[PDB]
Design a protein around this ligand. Structure first.
Ligand code: HEM
Ligand code: HEM
Ligand SMILES: Cc1cc(N)nc(COc2cc(CCN3CCC(F)CC3)cc(F)c2F)c1
Ligand SMILES: Cc1cc(N)nc(COc2cc(CCN3CCC(F)CC3)cc(F)c2F)c1
Ligand SMILES: C[C@H](O)[C@H](O)[C@H]1CNc2nc(N)[nH]c(=O)c2N1
Ligand SMILES: C[C@H](O)[C@H](O)[C@H]1CNc2nc(N)[nH]c(=O)c2N1
Ligand SMILES: [Zn+2]
Lengths: 409, 414
């Protein structure tokens, strides 16, 4: 029983959902870690986590206690006694993936949480199979431009030495090349991964927007390279609806944001390979990818073309050029009928999602630090929205980058 | 135990040991974070005050490289007898200056704390009446304003005693504009201040009923009914907002006061509560151009600005709001600079806060900071603080929120 207030509306929501959290958020009563990106770090161990999810699943359909429930427990309980684990019924698999997304406190997009396509890839055994499932995921999810949310779930962690992992952080990312002069070409955030792919035999075309290969690890084996068919990689070239010099900037971005490095936790099961894809919020590309200094850093480039007074910072030349960039992104995706959402709509829809969640569910964990868009913050409704943040399962956790943890054969 | 924060833009990692000294609660639990809650949550006894006083005194003497000295020991025994015989005690002036400066230094929600040690402290603890308060504040204002070359300052009034004799500035900030609800539901002036404007009008304030009326001060000395005073207009520095490019922007008739001066907060030093402690600095541009002008519960001018910018306001995705926001904040920054009124843009101010924070880690072992507030409310991630992990914890001496006096004051006359 905890209240959260919206200061712009004076609307007030009561939160009971948080009482059903059990994972430490990293904060204590003495020190908040709300801006820390990574705050926290057998039989009588896995069955509790399994028992809880199944209990939770049958509650979402009122079969709480019914003989299937009581039997599912014993079925799961004895699978652990022999096979040291258990497998999720298809329904449970789809419920858990939709509910890791429902519980993603950092995701502004969760108004769509129940509209999730779940591709079960738990029979997969090789990287070539991993490539096939992902190729199908990307095609389905891209859908000619009318994007659809989707997750593909590979076999669960079995012993750690047989993890399925997508080594790319995202299914679709541009390469990053260290330069002779010491600078960088392409996406700098990816230089390390690009160098891994080159070391692994990828032939870099050494351009600004080179689509990285899929680096796929199945059953703990060494990873393997695959080039996604380019006809599956929808890209949008960035032009501006006013500045006709903007296309001259040579900018483009891919259309499909697809997170492949996170871990999906259902009932004590760890799916170390579970790429999930949505559609972009415009700011992600226009603010973070294009303007972050550690990224494509086009701010200075745009202002030069914009005539702005880059003398002093109080001219706000960065802010002005920033807005124009994000106009050009939103307008380029919509000109190509590729799904995209601006931060105004997306935050507005998230306010409504919060209302919905407090009403039907009694709460909705949200990370204000991540929900508020990286530009124009206070002119969006989530800025004025108090948010409780807490960790419900099923969930997407982070996990160590595989190369830091993989013994090569 | 240490604690690491990383800057994700520069990969610099800092180590926080200073959190170990925090005491009051963040509001968070081990299972829930309240980091974005604005206010998570009669007077102390002898048995409470002793360890609070000894703690602050230990820290003051540890600050002046005099920990354990006889001055320190004598002071502790002096402070102890006072609490034992008077149930409270009185800060020396050095201790008040130190206490005020370190309450600003400990203010996690404040991005300007690089300036924390250049703070003019006005000891107003000899004040007994509201007229006396008005005189101390007038002096504060004139001093801080300095004909535009603003100087940080705090005026500190008698500490709380039993809780029934509090000093209070009912004004939330010393200089703010009146707001008037109209019969038709529209609001004239600043909508934020409409409840407070009514309170003044009830107390006898005759309101100009304009868009930019300076509210009277409403000053409460020693638990008594509060009393109204007009700040002398010559003492209220105001800036006409104009745009360097848009020659029509002056036609919006926007203006704002130069001195931001918070006066509803409670300054806590050594367990002593200074319920009236107006402090003042200089503005960051976004505070006026983003929150004051563009918040929808505020002056709410984006529409009208976009109109005259000929912006496609049909769909949000045109980013007409974002476009007009930048131009407003260009106008505010350009206007204060044109009249040589101290103001700081959000880039400069955040770049400086990163320097402060890093310096604070080196010399002090940490710097409690509230990311939700530190990040400017526009262009968040193109400012270095957005990529900067921060630890929030409450160090004392501290600035604290306190109940609005009109929700707690039992009136007296007729
Ligand atoms: C459909 C439209 C969607 C939109 C507009 C959207 C938007 C966003 C944005 C803007 C972020 C933060 C951006 C960043 O920091 O990189 C985020 C985070 C996240 N989203 Fe969504 N999302 C969408 C769909 C999905 C889907 C389909 C899932 C599937 C589970 C999902 C789960 C998550 C998770 C787990 C995070 C946190 C990622 C992290 O910690 O880095 N979202 N979302
Ligand atoms: C010297 C220049 C200063 C600058 C540029 C500055 C900037 C800011 C800004 C932008 C905020 C956010 C408040 C809001 O959004 O309403 C803030 C908060 C705050 N500042 Fe500073 N400030 C300055 C001086 C001071 C001084 C002199 C003190 C006290 C001695 C102080 C104590 C605080 C406190 C306690 C808060 C929290 C306000 C609250 O919680 O409502 N600041 N500051
Ligand atoms: C499901 C979904 C929908 C949506 N609309 N967006 C996303 C997020 O996808 C991405 C995020 C990033 C930034 C990652 N950033 C850097 C530090 C760490 F790597 C984590 C934070 C780059 C990128 F290329 C992306 F595709 C996911
Ligand atoms: C010393 C100092 C320096 C500085 N640069 N800024 C400040 C902050 O002072 C102010 C803040 C506001 C907004 C109040 N804000 C709104 C949400 C709720 F009402 C909580 C409070 C209006 C105003 F007129 C101010 F002066 C103080
Ligand atoms: C709900 C949220 O805490 C609230 O809108 C906060 C967010 N961050 C802020 N940051 C600053 N500087 N000033 C504010 O008033 C706020 N408001
Ligand atoms: C330090 C800070 O926690 C970090 O930079 C966060 C802030 N908020 C964010 N919000 C979003 N949406 N995405 C991010 O990557 C981040 N980064
Ligand atoms: Zn917290």
């Amino acid at each position: 029983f905890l209240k959260v207030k919206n200061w712009e509306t004076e609307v007030v929501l009561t939160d009971t959902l948080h009482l059903k959290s059990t994972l430490e958020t990293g904060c204590t009563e003495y020190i908040c870690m709300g801006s820390i990106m990574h705050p926290s770090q057998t039989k009588d161990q896995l069955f509790p986590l399994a028992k809880e999810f199944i209990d939770q699943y049958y509650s979402s359909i009122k079969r709480f206690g019914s003989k299937a429930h009581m039997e599912r427990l014993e079925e799961v309980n004895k699978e652990i006694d022999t096979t040291s684990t258990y497998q999720l019924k298809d329904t449970e698999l789809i419920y858990g993936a939709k509910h890791a997304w429902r519980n993603a406190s950092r995701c502004v997009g969760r108004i769509q949480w129940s509209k999730l396509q779940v591709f079960d890839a738990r029979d997969c055994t090789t990287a070539h199979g991993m490539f096939n499932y992902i190729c199908n995921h990307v095609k389905y999810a891209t859908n000619k431009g009318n994007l659809r949310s989707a997750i593909t779930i590979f076999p669960q962690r079995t012993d750690g030495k047989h993890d399925f992992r997508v080594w790319n952080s995202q299914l679709i990312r541009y390469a990053g090349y260290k330069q002779p002069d010491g600078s960088t070409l392409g996406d700098p955030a990816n230089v390390q991964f690009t160098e891994i792919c080159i070391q692994q035999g990828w032939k870099p075309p050494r351009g600004r927007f080179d689509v990285l290969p899929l680096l796929l690890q199945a059953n703990g084996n060494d990873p393997e390279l695959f080039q996604i068919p380019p006809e599956l990689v929808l890209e949008v070239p960035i032009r501006h609806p006013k500045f006709e010099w903007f296309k001259d900037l040579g900018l483009k971005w891919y259309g499909l944001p697809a997170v492949s490095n996170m871990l999906l936790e259902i009932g004590g099961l760890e799916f170390s390979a579970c790429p999930f894809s949505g559609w972009y919020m415009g700011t992600e590309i226009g603010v973070r990818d294009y303007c972050d200094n550690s990224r494509y850093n086009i701010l200075e480039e745009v202002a030069k073309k914009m005539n702005l007074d880059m003398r002093k910072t109080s001219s706000l030349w960065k802010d002005q050029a920033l807005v124009e960039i994000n106009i050009a992104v939103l307008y380029s995706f919509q000109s190509d009928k590729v799904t995209i959402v601006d931060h105004h709509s997306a935050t507005e829809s998230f306010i409504k999602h919060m209302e919905n969640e407090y009403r039907c569910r009694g709460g909705c964990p949200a990370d204000w630090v991540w929900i508020v868009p990286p530009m124009s913050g206070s002119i969006t409704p989530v800025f004025h929205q108090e948010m409780l943040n807490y960790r419900l399962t099923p969930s997407f956790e982070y996990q160590p980058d595989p190369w830091n943890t993989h013994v090569w054969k």
